[PDB]
């Protein structure tokens, strides 16, 4: 078995000649030479068995990705695993491999106007067809955003992705998920359900203004802090948009703190196209119901050079779960990740 | 000080209904496993069962901060950290 860093990364013979790329929680991910396809490849080891909430999101990953077929999302290629349940005990994901991503990208150039708008139209054109199933991603940030050398774009990252269910309540699997504060829309923070598409609209906004910056646009610290910073550009919410809170301390909180005035976009943003701003102003509304939908935010002024429904595919069908992931103990899942997984072993 | 951290948690309290509390307690359960058992019917009876399992005192605000974040309180929240900017502003008298 092929080792890396004192690890057992055990892919070969398809997949040899391992790179370390780089650690998270639960999964390290080397890029690897496929032998069959003549290409490098990425490769995430992920090992979730012991977490019920890793074991939901290894699963929720892998079915809507294999399900999904798109330009702007990744795909998965392959997937390795123990040929009998009880042996497995890590899961390697094999995927198309990408150069870059848009933070890492911002951290190290100013873009022109001319890739703002490209890289937002891709954006806008995967998100398109995620929604088209029903979808929500739920985890938009610039570090989701893959990129290959030529400006390519694939979203990526799909543990968070729910089917879209305004009516059903928390079970805390995304809150206990926090390195995304920068990105989540107001409603999230003030209401525990009711979200809607909506909530990737707000992350695509905080991308398109992190783009013409190089910076997050609310870059806040801890939880009242970021509705602090969201509040102080947006200004004071009006009654109509007091009246999305459900939540009556949430509301009345609100309702306590300082006037605030809006800042204008171009103060903020006084290099930034004129249409960019006005599309900005569409997807950064505080009220979740008002907010810009992704098919009338493709067919924005800003986008008019791109926006060509003939060439943006969308879902043949809305994705749905079988069965409710986030009730069931992590052994169930466990079966249903090596089911979900069999397609791809070699004695299948 | 303690009075300070008294004031707190009575202004908390005051904040905090019997349907509320029920939220809180559900927020907790995984983290200390007793809660069921422990017959908690208010809110400072939650704050003592809090502190007896090395959760809370007047210097150990962040697992509170944390509970009333995930609940969605951020009227309780701001209490807390005003108590916290209070706490810091006292001690530069004695330093």
């Known amino acids: 078995p092929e080792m890396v860093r004192g690890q057992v990364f055990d892919v070969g013979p398809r997949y040899t000649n391992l790179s370390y790329i780089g650690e998270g929680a639960y999964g390290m991910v080397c890029s690897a030479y496929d032998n069959v396809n003549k290409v490098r490849v990425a490769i995430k080891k992920i090992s979730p068995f012991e977490h019920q909430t890793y074991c939901q999101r290894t699963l929720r990953e892998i079915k809507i990705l294999l399900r999904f077929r798109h330009e702007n999302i990744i795909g998965i290629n392959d997937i390795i695993r123990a040929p009998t349940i009880e042996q497995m005990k890590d899961v390697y994901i094999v995927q198309d491999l990408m150069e870059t991503d848009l933070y890492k990208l911002l951290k190290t150039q100013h873009l022109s106007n001319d890739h703002i708008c490209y890289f937002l139209y891709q954006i806008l054109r995967g998100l398109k067809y995620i929604h088209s199933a029903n979808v929500l991603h739920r985890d938009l940030k610039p570090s989701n955003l893959l990129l290959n050398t030529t400006c390519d774009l694939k979203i990526c990252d799909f543990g968070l992705a729910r089917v879209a269910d305004p009516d059903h309540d928390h079970t805390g699997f995304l809150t206990e998920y926090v390195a995304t504060r920068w990105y989540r829309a107001p409603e999230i923070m003030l209401n525990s359900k009711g979200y809607t598409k909506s909530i990737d609209i707000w992350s695509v906004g905080c991308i398109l203004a992190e783009m013409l910056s190089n910076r997050p646009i609310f870059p806040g610290k801890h939880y009242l802090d970021q509705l602090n910073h969201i509040l102080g550009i947006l200004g004071s919410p009006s009654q109509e948009d007091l009246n999305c809170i459900i939540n009556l301390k949430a509301r009345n909180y609100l309702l306590s703190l300082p006037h605030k005035n809006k800042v204008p976009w171009n103060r903020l943003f006084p290099n930034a196209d004129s249409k960019a701003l006005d599309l900005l102003d569409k997807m950064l509304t505080f009220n979740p119901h008002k907010r810009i939908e992704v098919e009338q935010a493709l067919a924005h002024p800003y986008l008019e050079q791109y926006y060509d429904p003939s060439d943006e595919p969308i879902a043949e069908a809305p994705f749905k779960f079988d069965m409710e992931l986030d009730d069931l103990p992590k052994e169930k899942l466990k079966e249903l990740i090596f089911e979900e997984t069999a397609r791809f072993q070699p004695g299948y | ?95």
Not at chain 2, 16 to 44: H, M, N, R, V
Not at chain 2, 75 to 82: A, I, N, P
Request: charged share 35%; with cysteine; glycine share 4%.
């Open chain 2, 1 to 95: 000080g303690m009075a300070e951290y008294g004031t707190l948690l009575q202004d908390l309290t005051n904040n905090i209904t019997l349907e509320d509390l029920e939220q809180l307690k559900s927020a907790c359960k995984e983290d200390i496993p007793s809660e069921k058992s422990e017959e908690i019917t208010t809110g400072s009876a939650w704050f003592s069962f809090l502190e007896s399992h090395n959760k809370l005192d007047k210097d150990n605000l962040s697992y509170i901060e944390h509970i009333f974040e995930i609940s969605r309180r951020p009227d309780l929240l701001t209490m807390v950290v005003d108590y916290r900017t209070r706490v810091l502003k006292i001690s530069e008298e004695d330093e």
